[model samples]
Target: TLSIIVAHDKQRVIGYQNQLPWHLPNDLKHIKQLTTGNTLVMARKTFESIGKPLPNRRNVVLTNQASFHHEGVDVINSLDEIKELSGHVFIFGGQTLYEAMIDQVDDMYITVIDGKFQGDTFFPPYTFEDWEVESSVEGQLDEKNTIPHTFLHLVRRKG
Candidate 1:
Protein backbone atom coordinates (compact mmCIF):
# COMPACT_ATOMS: atom_id res chain seq x y z
CA THR A 1 0.00 0.00 0.00
CA LEU A 2 1.07 3.61 -0.59
CA SER A 3 0.94 6.18 2.20
CA ILE A 4 2.29 9.65 3.00
CA ILE A 5 4.04 10.87 6.11
CA VAL A 6 4.13 14.64 6.48
CA ALA A 7 4.26 17.49 9.00
CA HIS A 8 2.69 20.83 8.24
CA ASP A 9 1.36 23.86 10.04
CA LYS A 10 -2.26 25.05 10.10
CA GLN A 11 -1.74 26.97 6.87
CA ARG A 12 -0.45 23.76 5.29
CA VAL A 13 3.01 25.31 5.13
CA ILE A 14 5.47 22.46 5.04
CA GLY A 15 8.78 23.98 4.02
CA TYR A 16 10.72 27.21 4.20
CA GLN A 17 13.81 27.88 2.08
CA ASN A 18 13.69 24.19 1.06
CA GLN A 19 13.72 22.96 4.64
CA LEU A 20 11.24 22.41 7.46
CA PRO A 21 10.60 25.52 9.53
CA TRP A 22 9.66 23.96 12.87
CA HIS A 23 11.41 21.97 15.54
CA LEU A 24 9.09 19.10 16.37
CA PRO A 25 11.26 16.22 17.47
CA ASN A 26 8.36 14.04 18.53
CA ASP A 27 6.77 14.35 15.14
CA LEU A 28 10.07 13.51 13.50
CA LYS A 29 10.42 10.44 15.66
CA HIS A 30 6.91 9.32 14.81
CA ILE A 31 7.83 9.44 11.12
CA LYS A 32 10.83 7.19 11.68
CA GLN A 33 8.79 4.76 13.74
CA LEU A 34 6.19 4.28 11.02
CA THR A 35 8.56 4.36 8.04
CA THR A 36 11.41 2.30 9.47
CA GLY A 37 10.75 -0.92 7.60
CA ASN A 38 8.96 0.49 4.57
CA THR A 39 10.15 1.72 1.24
CA LEU A 40 10.46 5.52 1.01
CA VAL A 41 9.68 7.37 -2.21
CA MET A 42 10.80 10.98 -2.57
CA ALA A 43 11.70 13.51 -5.20
CA ARG A 44 15.33 14.28 -6.00
CA LYS A 45 15.41 17.56 -4.10
CA THR A 46 13.96 15.93 -1.01
CA PHE A 47 16.56 13.20 -1.22
CA GLU A 48 19.33 15.75 -1.59
CA SER A 49 18.10 17.68 1.40
CA ILE A 50 18.33 14.56 3.53
CA GLY A 51 22.02 14.31 2.38
CA LYS A 52 22.06 10.53 2.69
CA PRO A 53 19.86 7.46 2.61
CA LEU A 54 17.75 6.79 5.68
CA PRO A 55 19.02 3.60 7.24
CA ASN A 56 16.90 0.39 7.37
CA ARG A 57 14.68 1.38 4.47
CA ARG A 58 14.71 1.19 0.70
CA ASN A 59 15.26 4.67 -0.72
CA VAL A 60 13.64 5.37 -4.06
CA VAL A 61 14.38 8.75 -5.59
CA LEU A 62 12.16 10.15 -8.32
CA THR A 63 13.66 12.32 -11.03
CA ASN A 64 13.06 13.06 -14.69
CA GLN A 65 16.67 13.45 -15.69
CA ALA A 66 17.95 10.30 -17.38
CA SER A 67 21.49 10.70 -16.06
CA PHE A 68 20.68 11.26 -12.42
CA HIS A 69 22.35 8.89 -9.99
CA HIS A 70 23.05 8.69 -6.27
CA GLU A 71 25.06 6.15 -4.37
CA GLY A 72 23.03 3.73 -2.21
CA VAL A 73 19.72 4.86 -3.70
CA ASP A 74 17.44 3.76 -6.51
CA VAL A 75 16.56 6.49 -9.00
CA ILE A 76 13.49 6.22 -11.21
CA ASN A 77 11.96 8.60 -13.72
CA SER A 78 8.26 8.22 -13.17
CA LEU A 79 5.52 7.17 -10.75
CA ASP A 80 4.66 4.08 -12.83
CA GLU A 81 7.96 2.54 -11.86
CA ILE A 82 6.82 2.42 -8.24
CA LYS A 83 3.88 0.12 -9.06
CA GLU A 84 6.05 -2.98 -8.86
CA LEU A 85 7.57 -2.03 -5.51
CA SER A 86 6.72 -4.51 -2.80
CA GLY A 87 5.82 -3.86 0.84
CA HIS A 88 4.46 -0.62 2.26
CA VAL A 89 5.61 2.44 0.30
CA PHE A 90 5.72 5.76 2.14
CA ILE A 91 5.98 8.95 0.16
CA PHE A 92 8.49 11.07 2.08
CA GLY A 93 7.95 14.23 0.24
CA GLY A 94 8.53 17.56 -1.33
CA GLN A 95 5.38 19.41 -2.38
CA THR A 96 5.34 18.18 -5.96
CA LEU A 97 5.68 14.50 -5.12
CA TYR A 98 2.93 14.75 -2.54
CA GLU A 99 0.50 16.35 -4.94
CA ALA A 100 1.29 13.87 -7.69
CA MET A 101 0.76 10.79 -5.52
CA ILE A 102 -2.02 11.94 -3.20
CA ASP A 103 -4.81 10.18 -5.10
CA GLN A 104 -3.07 6.82 -4.95
CA VAL A 105 -2.38 7.02 -1.23
CA ASP A 106 -4.37 4.61 0.91
CA ASP A 107 -3.39 6.29 4.16
CA MET A 108 -1.82 9.44 5.58
CA TYR A 109 0.15 10.12 8.73
CA ILE A 110 -0.05 13.87 9.20
CA THR A 111 1.33 16.06 11.99
CA VAL A 112 -0.77 19.18 11.97
CA ILE A 113 0.84 21.96 13.95
CA ASP A 114 -1.31 24.36 15.96
CA GLY A 115 -0.35 27.59 14.23
CA LYS A 116 0.53 29.09 10.88
CA PHE A 117 4.24 29.37 9.99
CA GLN A 118 6.72 30.82 7.57
CA GLY A 119 7.08 28.66 4.48
CA ASP A 120 7.52 28.60 0.76
CA THR A 121 6.12 25.09 0.23
CA PHE A 122 2.73 23.73 1.18
CA PHE A 123 1.11 20.33 1.29
CA PRO A 124 -1.29 19.76 -1.56
CA PRO A 125 -4.89 20.82 -0.99
CA TYR A 126 -7.29 18.06 0.07
CA THR A 127 -10.65 18.31 1.77
CA PHE A 128 -10.52 14.75 3.20
CA GLU A 129 -14.12 14.27 2.10
CA ASP A 130 -13.30 10.72 1.05
CA TRP A 131 -11.33 9.96 4.17
CA GLU A 132 -11.88 9.29 7.85
CA VAL A 133 -9.66 9.72 10.86
CA GLU A 134 -8.38 6.40 12.16
CA SER A 135 -6.48 8.02 15.02
CA SER A 136 -5.50 11.41 16.36
CA VAL A 137 -2.85 11.85 19.05
CA GLU A 138 -1.83 15.15 20.61
CA GLY A 139 1.91 15.70 20.36
CA GLN A 140 4.15 16.25 23.37
CA LEU A 141 5.27 19.73 24.34
CA ASP A 142 8.47 20.36 26.26
CA GLU A 143 11.58 22.45 25.86
CA LYS A 144 12.72 20.26 23.02
CA ASN A 145 9.35 20.33 21.27
CA THR A 146 7.52 23.47 22.25
CA ILE A 147 4.94 23.50 19.52
CA PRO A 148 1.43 22.19 20.04
CA HIS A 149 0.59 19.59 17.43
CA THR A 150 -1.44 16.52 16.68
CA PHE A 151 -0.56 13.36 14.86
CA LEU A 152 -3.48 12.32 12.72
CA HIS A 153 -3.90 9.06 10.90
CA LEU A 154 -6.41 9.13 8.09
CA VAL A 155 -7.64 6.20 6.09
CA ARG A 156 -9.65 6.33 2.92
CA ARG A 157 -13.34 5.83 3.58
CA LYS A 158 -14.87 2.66 2.31
CA GLY A 159 -18.10 2.60 0.38
Candidate 2:
Protein backbone atom coordinates (compact mmCIF):
# COMPACT_ATOMS: atom_id res chain seq x y z
CA THR A 1 0.00 0.00 0.00
CA LEU A 2 1.20 3.51 -0.77
CA SER A 3 0.09 6.53 1.23
CA ILE A 4 0.96 10.16 1.59
CA ILE A 5 1.19 12.11 4.87
CA VAL A 6 0.68 15.85 4.75
CA ALA A 7 -0.33 18.65 7.07
CA HIS A 8 -1.29 22.20 6.29
CA ASP A 9 -2.84 25.28 7.83
CA LYS A 10 -6.11 27.05 7.04
CA GLN A 11 -4.42 28.84 4.20
CA ARG A 12 -2.72 25.68 2.94
CA VAL A 13 0.66 26.90 4.03
CA ILE A 14 2.88 24.07 5.08
CA GLY A 15 6.17 25.80 5.67
CA TYR A 16 7.34 29.23 6.48
CA GLN A 17 10.92 30.31 5.90
CA ASN A 18 12.15 26.72 5.69
CA GLN A 19 10.51 25.66 8.95
CA LEU A 20 7.25 24.71 10.51
CA PRO A 21 5.12 27.73 11.30
CA TRP A 22 4.36 26.25 14.70
CA HIS A 23 5.34 23.38 16.98
CA LEU A 24 3.10 20.55 18.03
CA PRO A 25 4.60 17.50 19.66
CA ASN A 26 1.29 15.71 19.49
CA ASP A 27 1.27 15.91 15.72
CA LEU A 28 4.77 14.49 15.68
CA LYS A 29 3.53 11.62 17.78
CA HIS A 30 0.80 10.90 15.27
CA ILE A 31 3.29 11.03 12.43
CA LYS A 32 5.60 8.60 14.18
CA GLN A 33 2.73 6.27 14.90
CA LEU A 34 1.83 5.92 11.24
CA THR A 35 5.32 5.87 9.71
CA THR A 36 7.37 3.93 12.21
CA GLY A 37 6.64 0.55 10.72
CA ASN A 38 6.56 1.53 7.06
CA THR A 39 8.83 2.54 4.25
CA LEU A 40 9.01 6.30 3.60
CA VAL A 41 10.02 8.05 0.40
CA MET A 42 10.92 11.74 0.33
CA ALA A 43 12.36 14.38 -1.97
CA ARG A 44 15.94 15.57 -1.73
CA LYS A 45 14.97 18.80 -0.06
CA THR A 46 12.81 16.97 2.44
CA PHE A 47 15.58 14.50 3.17
CA GLU A 48 18.11 17.25 3.53
CA SER A 49 15.87 19.19 5.86
CA ILE A 50 15.70 16.24 8.22
CA GLY A 51 19.43 15.62 7.77
CA LYS A 52 19.16 11.88 8.22
CA PRO A 53 16.97 8.87 7.83
CA LEU A 54 14.34 8.39 10.50
CA PRO A 55 14.92 5.57 12.89
CA ASN A 56 12.76 2.41 12.76
CA ARG A 57 11.57 2.84 9.19
CA ARG A 58 13.11 2.36 5.78
CA ASN A 59 13.83 5.73 4.18
CA VAL A 60 13.97 6.16 0.45
CA VAL A 61 14.96 9.36 -1.32
CA LEU A 62 13.76 10.39 -4.75
CA THR A 63 16.07 12.38 -6.94
CA ASN A 64 16.88 12.73 -10.62
CA GLN A 65 20.58 12.74 -9.87
CA ALA A 66 21.95 9.21 -10.14
CA SER A 67 25.03 10.10 -8.13
CA PHE A 68 23.14 10.80 -4.95
CA HIS A 69 23.68 8.39 -2.07
CA HIS A 70 23.34 8.51 1.69
CA GLU A 71 24.33 6.32 4.64
CA GLY A 72 20.90 4.95 5.40
CA VAL A 73 18.75 6.22 2.55
CA ASP A 74 17.92 4.42 -0.68
CA VAL A 75 17.88 6.45 -3.88
CA ILE A 76 15.61 6.08 -6.89
CA ASN A 77 15.46 8.25 -9.97
CA SER A 78 12.04 7.23 -11.13
CA LEU A 79 8.64 6.73 -9.54
CA ASP A 80 8.08 3.64 -11.71
CA GLU A 81 10.77 1.91 -9.73
CA ILE A 82 8.52 2.07 -6.67
CA LYS A 83 5.64 0.15 -8.19
CA GLU A 84 7.16 -3.11 -7.04
CA LEU A 85 7.60 -1.93 -3.49
CA SER A 86 5.46 -3.93 -1.16
CA GLY A 87 4.12 -3.55 2.36
CA HIS A 88 3.15 -0.08 3.56
CA VAL A 89 5.11 2.40 1.47
CA PHE A 90 4.64 6.12 2.05
CA ILE A 91 5.35 9.25 0.05
CA PHE A 92 6.55 11.93 2.44
CA GLY A 93 7.01 15.19 0.63
CA GLY A 94 8.20 18.66 -0.29
CA GLN A 95 5.92 19.84 -3.15
CA THR A 96 7.73 18.58 -6.27
CA LEU A 97 7.63 14.90 -5.47
CA TYR A 98 4.16 15.24 -4.00
CA GLU A 99 2.81 16.82 -7.18
CA ALA A 100 4.57 14.21 -9.28
CA MET A 101 3.16 11.25 -7.38
CA ILE A 102 -0.31 12.52 -6.45
CA ASP A 103 -2.03 10.34 -9.00
CA GLN A 104 -0.23 7.28 -7.76
CA VAL A 105 -1.05 7.74 -4.09
CA ASP A 106 -3.37 5.07 -2.78
CA ASP A 107 -4.23 6.81 0.45
CA MET A 108 -3.58 10.05 2.27
CA TYR A 109 -3.28 11.17 5.88
CA ILE A 110 -3.79 14.89 6.28
CA THR A 111 -3.99 17.33 9.17
CA VAL A 112 -5.81 20.60 8.82
CA ILE A 113 -4.32 23.13 11.21
CA ASP A 114 -6.59 25.73 12.76
CA GLY A 115 -4.90 28.84 11.41
CA LYS A 116 -2.94 30.40 8.62
CA PHE A 117 0.85 30.40 8.51
CA GLN A 118 3.73 31.99 6.72
CA GLY A 119 5.46 30.01 3.95
CA ASP A 120 7.17 29.86 0.60
CA THR A 121 6.32 26.17 0.15
CA PHE A 122 3.17 24.14 -0.44
CA PHE A 123 1.97 20.54 -0.63
CA PRO A 124 0.96 20.80 -4.27
CA PRO A 125 -2.60 21.58 -5.20
CA TYR A 126 -5.07 18.71 -4.89
CA THR A 127 -8.83 18.68 -4.91
CA PHE A 128 -10.62 17.31 -1.87
CA GLU A 129 -13.54 16.17 -3.98
CA ASP A 130 -11.30 13.58 -5.58
CA TRP A 131 -10.90 11.74 -2.28
CA GLU A 132 -13.37 10.11 0.06
CA VAL A 133 -12.81 10.70 3.71
CA GLU A 134 -12.48 7.40 5.49
CA SER A 135 -12.00 8.86 8.92
CA SER A 136 -11.89 12.11 10.82
CA VAL A 137 -10.59 12.95 14.27
CA GLU A 138 -10.36 16.25 16.07
CA GLY A 139 -7.01 16.99 17.59
CA GLN A 140 -7.34 18.96 20.82
CA LEU A 141 -6.07 22.49 21.21
CA ASP A 142 -2.55 22.80 22.50
CA GLU A 143 -2.47 25.74 24.85
CA LYS A 144 1.18 26.45 24.48
CA ASN A 145 1.92 26.27 20.79
CA THR A 146 -1.06 25.40 18.64
CA ILE A 147 -4.83 25.23 18.24
CA PRO A 148 -7.44 22.67 17.32
CA HIS A 149 -7.00 20.70 14.11
CA THR A 150 -8.53 17.69 12.40
CA PHE A 151 -6.83 14.59 11.13
CA LEU A 152 -8.32 13.04 8.06
CA HIS A 153 -7.67 9.73 6.40
CA LEU A 154 -8.87 9.67 2.81
CA VAL A 155 -8.80 7.41 -0.18
CA ARG A 156 -9.30 8.31 -3.81
CA ARG A 157 -12.78 7.66 -5.13
CA LYS A 158 -13.08 5.25 -8.00
CA GLY A 159 -14.79 6.22 -11.22
Candidate 3:
Protein backbone atom coordinates (compact mmCIF):
# COMPACT_ATOMS: atom_id res chain seq x y z
CA THR A 1 0.00 0.00 0.00
CA LEU A 2 1.12 3.56 -0.70
CA SER A 3 0.32 6.21 1.87
CA ILE A 4 1.11 9.79 2.80
CA ILE A 5 1.59 11.16 6.28
CA VAL A 6 1.51 14.89 6.91
CA ALA A 7 0.86 17.53 9.50
CA HIS A 8 -0.17 21.00 8.49
CA ASP A 9 -1.66 24.11 10.01
CA LYS A 10 -4.99 25.70 9.17
CA GLN A 11 -3.42 27.38 6.16
CA ARG A 12 -1.99 24.05 5.03
CA VAL A 13 1.50 25.22 5.78
CA ILE A 14 3.61 22.11 6.14
CA GLY A 15 7.05 23.62 6.32
CA TYR A 16 9.08 26.70 7.16
CA GLN A 17 12.77 26.99 6.32
CA ASN A 18 12.92 23.24 5.49
CA GLN A 19 11.52 22.24 8.88
CA LEU A 20 8.13 21.78 10.42
CA PRO A 21 6.49 25.06 11.41
CA TRP A 22 5.28 23.73 14.73
CA HIS A 23 6.85 21.67 17.52
CA LEU A 24 4.26 19.15 18.54
CA PRO A 25 5.70 16.08 20.20
CA ASN A 26 2.27 14.52 20.06
CA ASP A 27 2.36 14.56 16.29
CA LEU A 28 5.90 13.29 16.32
CA LYS A 29 4.91 10.31 18.44
CA HIS A 30 1.90 9.69 16.28
CA ILE A 31 4.06 9.51 13.15
CA LYS A 32 6.45 7.14 14.85
CA GLN A 33 3.58 4.95 15.87
CA LEU A 34 2.04 4.71 12.43
CA THR A 35 5.19 4.42 10.32
CA THR A 36 7.48 2.43 12.55
CA GLY A 37 7.30 -0.85 10.69
CA ASN A 38 6.62 0.50 7.23
CA THR A 39 8.75 1.80 4.40
CA LEU A 40 9.26 5.57 4.31
CA VAL A 41 9.87 7.39 1.04
CA MET A 42 10.80 11.05 1.26
CA ALA A 43 12.55 13.88 -0.56
CA ARG A 44 16.19 14.57 0.21
CA LYS A 45 15.28 17.79 1.97
CA THR A 46 12.76 15.97 4.11
CA PHE A 47 15.30 13.33 5.07
CA GLU A 48 17.87 15.97 5.85
CA SER A 49 15.37 17.85 7.96
CA ILE A 50 14.82 14.66 9.92
CA GLY A 51 18.66 14.33 10.19
CA LYS A 52 18.80 10.56 10.73
CA PRO A 53 17.24 7.32 9.68
CA LEU A 54 14.13 6.59 11.67
CA PRO A 55 14.74 3.24 13.34
CA ASN A 56 13.02 -0.02 12.37
CA ARG A 57 11.75 1.36 9.04
CA ARG A 58 13.13 1.25 5.55
CA ASN A 59 14.31 4.76 4.65
CA VAL A 60 14.32 5.55 0.95
CA VAL A 61 15.45 9.00 -0.01
CA LEU A 62 14.23 10.29 -3.35
CA THR A 63 16.60 12.80 -4.89
CA ASN A 64 18.14 13.83 -8.19
CA GLN A 65 21.56 14.43 -6.70
CA ALA A 66 23.66 11.39 -7.53
CA SER A 67 26.21 12.03 -4.83
CA PHE A 68 23.78 12.36 -1.94
CA HIS A 69 24.48 9.66 0.63
CA HIS A 70 23.47 8.95 4.20
CA GLU A 71 24.91 6.16 6.32
CA GLY A 72 21.76 4.08 6.50
CA VAL A 73 19.58 5.64 3.79
CA ASP A 74 18.71 4.43 0.33
CA VAL A 75 18.76 7.05 -2.45
CA ILE A 76 16.86 6.91 -5.71
CA ASN A 77 16.70 9.35 -8.61
CA SER A 78 13.15 8.88 -9.85
CA LEU A 79 9.63 8.34 -8.63
CA ASP A 80 9.28 5.12 -10.62
CA GLU A 81 11.85 3.46 -8.39
CA ILE A 82 9.32 3.51 -5.57
CA LYS A 83 6.95 1.28 -7.50
CA GLU A 84 9.52 -1.51 -7.38
CA LEU A 85 9.56 -1.47 -3.63
CA SER A 86 7.62 -4.11 -1.75
CA GLY A 87 5.54 -3.83 1.41
CA HIS A 88 3.61 -0.84 2.74
CA VAL A 89 5.17 2.47 1.71
CA PHE A 90 4.57 5.83 3.32
CA ILE A 91 5.60 9.05 1.67
CA PHE A 92 6.57 11.73 4.11
CA GLY A 93 6.94 15.11 2.54
CA GLY A 94 8.57 18.44 1.96
CA GLN A 95 5.99 19.45 -0.67
CA THR A 96 7.76 18.12 -3.77
CA LEU A 97 7.55 14.44 -2.93
CA TYR A 98 4.01 14.81 -1.69
CA GLU A 99 2.99 16.37 -4.99
CA ALA A 100 4.73 13.65 -6.94
CA MET A 101 3.28 10.74 -4.99
CA ILE A 102 -0.20 12.03 -4.22
CA ASP A 103 -1.66 10.49 -7.34
CA GLN A 104 -0.50 7.03 -6.32
CA VAL A 105 -1.49 7.31 -2.68
CA ASP A 106 -4.08 4.80 -1.51
CA ASP A 107 -4.24 6.08 2.03
CA MET A 108 -3.62 9.41 3.72
CA TYR A 109 -2.97 10.26 7.34
CA ILE A 110 -3.24 13.94 8.08
CA THR A 111 -2.78 15.99 11.20
CA VAL A 112 -4.52 19.31 10.94
CA ILE A 113 -3.48 21.86 13.51
CA ASP A 114 -6.09 24.31 14.64
CA GLY A 115 -4.09 27.48 14.21
CA LYS A 116 -2.60 29.70 11.56
CA PHE A 117 1.14 29.78 11.02
CA GLN A 118 3.74 31.63 8.97
CA GLY A 119 5.44 29.31 6.52
CA ASP A 120 7.12 29.17 3.14
CA THR A 121 6.00 25.73 1.96
CA PHE A 122 2.46 24.50 1.82
CA PHE A 123 0.84 21.13 1.18
CA PRO A 124 0.21 20.87 -2.54
CA PRO A 125 -3.32 21.64 -3.67
CA TYR A 126 -5.48 18.49 -3.50
CA THR A 127 -9.17 17.79 -3.18
CA PHE A 128 -10.38 14.60 -1.53
CA GLU A 129 -13.39 14.22 -3.78
CA ASP A 130 -12.67 10.53 -4.35
CA TRP A 131 -11.64 9.66 -0.84
CA GLU A 132 -13.60 8.37 2.12
CA VAL A 133 -12.89 9.16 5.73
CA GLU A 134 -11.75 6.17 7.77
CA SER A 135 -11.25 7.82 11.10
CA SER A 136 -10.69 11.12 12.87
CA VAL A 137 -9.42 11.71 16.38
CA GLU A 138 -8.57 14.89 18.20
CA GLY A 139 -5.10 15.60 19.48
CA GLN A 140 -4.46 16.57 23.03
CA LEU A 141 -3.51 20.05 24.17
CA ASP A 142 -1.03 20.41 26.97
CA GLU A 143 1.68 22.80 28.10
CA LYS A 144 4.07 21.52 25.46
CA ASN A 145 1.50 21.04 22.77
CA THR A 146 -0.71 24.10 22.97
CA ILE A 147 -2.27 24.01 19.55
CA PRO A 148 -5.35 21.84 19.06
CA HIS A 149 -5.11 19.28 16.30
CA THR A 150 -6.95 16.37 14.72
CA PHE A 151 -5.64 13.22 13.17
CA LEU A 152 -7.55 12.16 10.07
CA HIS A 153 -7.36 8.94 8.12
CA LEU A 154 -8.64 8.78 4.57
CA VAL A 155 -8.86 5.97 2.04
CA ARG A 156 -9.19 6.55 -1.67
CA ARG A 157 -12.42 5.27 -3.16
CA LYS A 158 -12.13 2.87 -6.02
CA GLY A 159 -14.36 2.93 -9.07
Candidate 1 lDDT (Cα, 0 to 1): 0.81
Alpha-carbon lDDT, every model: 0.81, 0.77, 0.82
Model 2 residue runs over 4 Å out of place are 16-22
C-alpha lDDT of residue 40 in model 3: 87
lDDT tens string, model 2, 1-159?
889887888776774322222376666777788989889887777787778888999989888987888998988888897777778998877766677777888888888887876776677666777888899999876575467789989898888
Model 3 vs truth, CA RMSD: 1.8
TM-score ranking from best to worst? 1, 3, 2
Which pairs clash inside model 2?
none
Candidate 1, clashing residue pairs? none
**Candidate 3 C-alpha lDDT tens digits along 1-159:** 998888888788883534433478887788788878889888888788879998999999998897898998988899998888889998887787777877788989988888876777777665668778899999888998888899999898888
Best model number under lDDT: 3
- Please say which candidate is ahead in lDDT: 2 or 3: 3
Candidates ranked by lDDT:
3, 1, 2
* Residue-level lDDT for 145 in candidate 3: 84
The TM-score obtained by model 1 is 0.91
